[PDB]
Amino acid sequence: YRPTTDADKIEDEVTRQVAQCKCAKRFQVEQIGENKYRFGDSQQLRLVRILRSTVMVRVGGGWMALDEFLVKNDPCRARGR
Ligand code: NI
- Cα 34 to middle of ligand 1, angstroms: 24
Q: At what angle do helices 6-18 and 66-73 cross, to 10 degrees?
A: 40
Burial (CB count within 10 angstroms: exposed 0-12, middle 13-18, buried 19+), residue 9: middle
Residues facing 74 on adjacent strands: none
- Cα 72 to middle of ligand 1, angstroms: 11
Please name which of 80, 77, 81, 78 lies closest in space to residue 18, comparing C-alpha atoms. 77
Q: This structure's resolution (angstroms)?
A: 1.5
Burial (CB count within 10 angstroms: exposed 0-12, middle 13-18, buried 19+), residue 39: buried
Spatial contact of 68 and 62, defined as CB atoms under 8 Å apart:
no
Order of strands, sheet of 29-31, starting from the edge strand that comes earlier in the sequence:
29-31, 36-39, 45-51, 54-59, 62-65
Letter string b/e over residues 43-74, b meaning 16 or more CB atoms within 10 A of that residue's CB: eeebebeeeeeebbbbeeeebbebbebbeebb
Read off φ and ψ for residue 58, nearest 5 degrees: -75, 125
- Cα 23 to middle of ligand 1, angstroms: 4
- Cα 58 to middle of ligand 1, angstroms: 20
Alpha helical stretches, state H, 1-52: 6-18
- Expt. technique: X-ray
Domain spans of the chain, in order of start: 1-81
- Cα 78 to middle of ligand 1, angstroms: 9
Q: What is the dihedral of CA 63, 10, 41, 74, to 10 degrees?
A: -70
What 8-state DSSP symbol labels residue 75? G
